[PDB]
Scaffold this active site. Sequence first.
Site, mmCIF file in Angstrom:
data_model
loop_
_atom_site.group_PDB
_atom_site.id
_atom_site.type_symbol
_atom_site.label_atom_id
_atom_site.label_comp_id
_atom_site.label_asym_id
_atom_site.label_seq_id
_atom_site.Cartn_x
_atom_site.Cartn_y
_atom_site.Cartn_z
ATOM 1 N N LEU A 1 0.825 -1.199 0.000
ATOM 2 C CA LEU A 1 0.000 0.000 0.000
ATOM 3 C C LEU A 1 0.862 1.254 0.000
ATOM 4 O O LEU A 1 1.826 1.364 0.762
ATOM 5 C CB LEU A 1 -0.938 0.027 1.210
ATOM 6 C CG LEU A 1 -2.162 -0.892 1.224
ATOM 7 C CD1 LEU A 1 -1.808 -2.291 1.717
ATOM 8 C CD2 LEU A 1 -3.321 -0.292 2.013
ATOM 9 N N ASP A 2 0.507 2.195 -0.863
ATOM 10 C CA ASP A 2 1.026 3.544 -0.774
ATOM 11 C C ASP A 2 0.379 4.257 0.409
ATOM 12 O O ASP A 2 -0.717 3.892 0.841
ATOM 13 C CB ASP A 2 0.745 4.297 -2.072
ATOM 14 N N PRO A 3 1.044 5.261 0.976
ATOM 15 C CA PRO A 3 0.394 6.071 2.008
ATOM 16 C C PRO A 3 -0.708 6.934 1.413
ATOM 17 O O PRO A 3 -0.738 7.209 0.211
ATOM 18 C CB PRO A 3 1.536 6.927 2.564
ATOM 19 C CG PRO A 3 2.523 6.991 1.454
ATOM 20 C CD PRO A 3 2.452 5.650 0.787
#
Lengths: 94, 344, 57, 121, 12, 58, 58, 139
Positions: free
Chosen positions: B77-79
């Site tokens: 996951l990206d932030p």
Amino acid sequence: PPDTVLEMGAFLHPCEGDIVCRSINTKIPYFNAPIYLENKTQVGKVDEILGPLNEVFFTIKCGDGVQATSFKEGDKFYIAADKLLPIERFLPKP
Amino acid sequence: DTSEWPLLLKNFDKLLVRSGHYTPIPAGSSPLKRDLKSYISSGVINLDKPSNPSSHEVVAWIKRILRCEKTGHSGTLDPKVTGCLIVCIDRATRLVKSQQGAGKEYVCIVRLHDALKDEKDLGRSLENLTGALFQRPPLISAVKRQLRVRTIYESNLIEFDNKRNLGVFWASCEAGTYMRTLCVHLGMLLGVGGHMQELRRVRSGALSENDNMVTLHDVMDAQWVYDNTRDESYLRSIIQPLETLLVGYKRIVVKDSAVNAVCYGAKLMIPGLLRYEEGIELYDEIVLITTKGEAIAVAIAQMSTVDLASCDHGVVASVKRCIMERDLYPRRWGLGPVAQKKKQ
Amino acid sequence: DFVIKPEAAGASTDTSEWPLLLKNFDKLLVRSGHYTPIPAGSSPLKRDLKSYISSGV
Amino acid sequence: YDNTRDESYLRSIIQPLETLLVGYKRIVVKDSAVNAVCYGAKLMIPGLLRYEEGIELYDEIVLITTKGEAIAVAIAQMSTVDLASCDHGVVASVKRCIMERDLYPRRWGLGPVAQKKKQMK
Amino acid sequence: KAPNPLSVKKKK
Amino acid sequence: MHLMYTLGPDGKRIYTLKKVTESGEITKSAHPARFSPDDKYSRQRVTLKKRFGLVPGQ
Amino acid sequence: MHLMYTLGPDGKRIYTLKKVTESGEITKSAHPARFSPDDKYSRQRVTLKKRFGLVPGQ
Amino acid sequence: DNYEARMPAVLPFAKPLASKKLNKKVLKTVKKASKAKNVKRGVKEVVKALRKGEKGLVVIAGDISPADVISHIPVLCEDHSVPYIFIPSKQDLGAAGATKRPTSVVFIVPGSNKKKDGKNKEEEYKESFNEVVKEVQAL
RNA sequence: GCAUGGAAUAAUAGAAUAGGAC
RNA sequence: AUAGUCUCGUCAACGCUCGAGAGGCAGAGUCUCAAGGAGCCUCCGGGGGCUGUUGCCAUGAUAUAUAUGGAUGAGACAGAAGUGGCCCCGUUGACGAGACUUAGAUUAAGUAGGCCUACCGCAGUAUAUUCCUAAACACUAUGAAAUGACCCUAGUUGGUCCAUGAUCAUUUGGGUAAAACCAUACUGCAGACAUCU
């Protein structure tokens, strides 16, 4: 200076001060590999490799003193032959 | 009415019958009818992850709320990414990567630095990057930055606005693909430059946003309800069994006498087999379940359909991962007829 | 509750819908059913692509 | 397949070779005897699992495994009633071997009569 | 650049 | 934020940028509200959703 | 060309000379297109067939 | 006008809903109180004021997506014996609150301004405020 | 590329000083 | 030794469309051929119909040339060039060359050693620990808001964020940095062909 150079890319877009190139050659360059012109003059370093497998593009980060607007369509960019990798290396192993 | 049966017992009549007769053992329970401690200890939460926390932070918050032993997730996951997040609780943490081959699906907003000359350029580039792609992970990702080939199976440009300079598109992709580098590559190929404005995951693994997705507020509220009022209905509503993560697997139903033997690490044999799916292939990842519907294990098949149908003895499957608690079912091995003949 | 009951309704095997060269497998007379399978080989439709193309028409 | 790496379109256009062998009469071989038949040995009674009804003397047959793949095109050496009746005999001779040689492990020489002959030798 | 002492240990 | 959604006839989401769809539907935000672990208002939400039956347990 | 066909109810070809059958169905051409090994147009055909889901095995 | 647009977007738990005369009375009430600077705007300010213990009327916007942003508020108002009313428009509530952006929740407390001009404005405001809260408690 | 550096504790590639048992 | 299988090059016989050319296919360059013209009539300068089962180009192919086709094409350069771009009939038997085997198809819970040990199967624990400090992300506490805040050679209404909390401060305190798998070391559980009627 490189001993030999090979036809790496063709000028496509000058976007954001970096050179977008269609990859004429059939092998994948090293990251941060020096890109030359045919008089073996360094224009910049490879910044990004993108695009699908059938049509590979790469973005060159221009060196200082080089501007992206100075080039025109159909220009060729060259790389030393040591800075290449086979395409099947990045493909998943059987 | 077997299509309305829940979890891994759905469409159980389609399974080929190896032996239609068995005697039930009054041990264990249905996954939806488990006791609450065993229900939480085998639970899976499909969660609407908010934007500003991290994935590990969200998992830690869930661990703090439920007071459970351990929690885990699986995703690159990206932030600042909302949307679908599967949080496995305790035992279910062994199944975080069981549905990695199912891929993921995002809905992404790309912001372009300059307006395009024509609107169809973004659509042409989006269909251009559909397929195998060369990607390098961003510096934000914890993994090392190396060039990899990742497949985007499908893409669709939902909307595009030049005046707002914003484009909404849905992308179905292989696991490990980054929408940030996708938006960057789109911005380079349009030649105006672009990046990722917003990202939301609409499908992760087997579960989507329609498959009982709840928020963190619902988790805290259900825990408070169980703490103060001792009402389990809201906690059972938010929390799904781990069998939801095991859908799409080829199923083998095991006799109740062989469940504990498989839990002790034995191979499954032909006399333990009850029913099986059509077209089970050798060296294929399958799930061993029981008649109550709870999953014993994730196994690797050692037989094909013809040998499952015709052979009298031999190794059916070998346990790869064990899910069921040991000694939940009583041990019944050594009592077989040919086993008693060999012992005598 | 939803529990698979003894002698419940289930699909019996049907070799008519089985794939190529396995169709009507019940029609073959059985010399012996006692054998030990060897975990090797593959189904014709489930081969890897190199073996599938090398065995293809 | 070269550019997208998808295999479904190649698998759609290409059919298995066993589509050419549908009309042949089938004989099912044990997995221990598969490699011996691939090496040119005559198939015998212990390697036999199933035999199709209607097999005649010196008839074209296909030797298949339990996974449905074709070992060889062979010449039948006993009829169906002779297959059911006798306990020792040769059932087929390989006309054309289709399967790769070492696709299955070499499991010949492992048996009661085989090891008895080896020990007496 | 070295394995941890608890990562690799001599057999008992 | 920017991403909004409307419910389709099937029930699946349809994602849009406009606040109001051309059919007259009012789009809702596709992002959940922010959560803080140090939150002391579970009782209020549980009670208010219980008076209207919006609690998933009920 | 002269050899025309229509697909039957069971999925088999029915051959005729007539451009339009009795029921009004427009007949197809039984002969396939010309091929060259130096055909450099696989990409365009795959792209256009993928836009409409006409690729076999899709 | 704005009611016909914002009515389909109201949340199910939005009770009670004000009618048209009550709508205009509440909106002019919020405008007058914001001119008197007695208004607290936003969820956080209203929650903090309710924990502080001041008394007054609460006006909650009826179309909040997600609903959780206003889910905890009516019961918290009932815990402090504080009346509340729902308006299905958030843009109108923000515009009445002397801000351009929409405002979900408005809390009006008398005597929150130390200025004498604000005190005189609240003195002129008090009759309309009392009539509005009487109509709210009538529901 | 995955939270940096210092101090203490533990282990280690070890090397040494003072000593036993053989 | 005998026999079988796989991959090949030669001879003999037997059939067939009778088999290496001035050949065909694929590809590149130039040129020619598409009723795109002309004349009559019409209906409202334009449109429709006819001369027009016409004209232009190619083909004698087991062949009606008063014919059959024409861009989902044909012909000439070209009997050329090129092939290091591809293609030019099958069956049986014998001989010769490189090989792989000489196979009777095992195992209803394991392997190797001295009753025991080790390995094998499954589930666990550890993969440095404590304190201080540096950094990142987000929350929370306090003061500031609609004449709100920020950015750009900068605007006849530019763009972005914003009470669903923006942008600055102040320190108020706590939170997050996982999980899965491999490898190593240790612990525990069993030797399981599944009776249950």
